[PDB]
Write a protein that binds this ligand. Structure first.
Ligand code: D5V
Length: 330
């Protein structure tokens, strides 16, 4: 089997991407944030505290003839940005772009943090990291991909995120028309439960390539590119007037600037992030200070190849017995 679904930026900055997902019988369609950096499928629901729902579409398990309460199961997750949610668990039928999983754990939120409440466009998350990170207790549950894998034509999914435009998540096949040149595959460590890999280096604009190992995770649920402070300083040094602002929370730059590209290495291959992918616009409405899309990972504890990086590539998440990651230009 295969599945194919369009993923769409939630706003003009590509702050996140949402993908329609069918849950239950009859189908209830929710727009979920596909997150290769976590492993819970959770949704706003009829059980979510009323004051914490503001415009989201909710899952109502009582209206689904295939929903079953997973007795005694609860979940609670806290994300790297400080966001959180928690609740109980149903199993139900879940379909993505024509690919159907029966008995998928659908984690129903009773509580969500303010950041989720304030995001009216995101109805929940669909985790695509390794199932070892799933937070359901006392019986850990599998991700949608984990459940689908054996049925897929090939045990893979691909992320093709657009810049200020829609893109595609495919399951079970590699669309050879969706990228240019070849896909370069690179080793993955699953030891921390992430799609963790090691970039071979970087370049800033037309500068020389610096060969250096950068361990990080491929994370579709993180907006920006978080890299070591040395690398990030080298990038913003090429932007006149750019500086790190403790009050704003990272590097900012004059909105009148032209940003240089940023290249990262995948083995001997190179992925080029165009400069305008690194512009996240005024720090507040009407400001001439703009927020940068490349930020320091100091304090996070891990480097993160988020959407700023991934949207410059066609990315293969290869879930074979020894997982790997593939990157192609597009
Ligand atoms: N793996 C990522 C996860 O999806 C988000 S949770 C989130 C919060 C608000 C809006 C959308 C998503 C959090 O920030 C980056 C990292 O942890």
């Amino acid at each position: 089997s295969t599945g194919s679904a369009t993923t769409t930026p939630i706003d003009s900055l590509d702050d996140a991407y949402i993908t329609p997902v069918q849950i239950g019988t009859p189908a209830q369609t929710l727009n979920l944030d596909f997150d290769t950096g976590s492993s819970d499928l959770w949704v706003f629901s009829s059980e979510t505290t009323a004051s914490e729902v503001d415009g989201q579409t909710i899952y109502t398990p009582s209206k689904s003839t295939t929903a079953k309460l997973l007795s005694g199961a609860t979940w609670s997750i806290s994300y790297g940005d400080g966001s959180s949610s928690s609740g109980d668990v149903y199993t139900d039928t879940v379909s993505v772009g024509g690919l159907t999983v029966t008995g998928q754990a659908v984690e129903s939120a009773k509580k969500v943090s303010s950041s989720f409440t304030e995001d009216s466009t995101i109805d929940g998350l669909l985790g695509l990291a390794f199932s070892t990170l799933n937070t359901v207790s006392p019986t850990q549950q599998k991700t949608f991909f984990d459940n689908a894998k054996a049925s897929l034509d090939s045990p893979v999914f691909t992320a093709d995120l657009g810049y200020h435009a829609p893109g595609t998540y495919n399951f079970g096949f590699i669309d050879t028309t969706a990228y240019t040149g070849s896909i370069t595959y690179t080793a993955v460590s699953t030891k921390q439960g992430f799609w963790e890999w090691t970039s071979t280096g970087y370049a800033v604009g037309s500068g020389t390539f610096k060969s250096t190992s950068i361990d990080g995770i491929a994370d579709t649920g993180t907006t920006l590119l978080y890299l070591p402070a040395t690398v990030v300083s080298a990038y913003w040094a090429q932007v006149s007037g750019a500086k790190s602002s403790s009050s704003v929370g990272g590097y900012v730059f004059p909105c009148s600037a032209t940003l240089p590209s940023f290249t990262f290495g995948v083995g001997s291959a190179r992925i080029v992030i165009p400069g305008d992918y690194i512009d996240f616009g005024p720090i507040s409405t009407g400001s001439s200070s703009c927020f940068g899309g490349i930020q320091s990972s100091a304090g996070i504890g891990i480097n993160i190849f988020g959407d700023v990086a991934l949207k410059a590539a066609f990315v293969v998440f290869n879930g074979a017995t020894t997982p790997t990651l593939g990157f192609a230009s597009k």
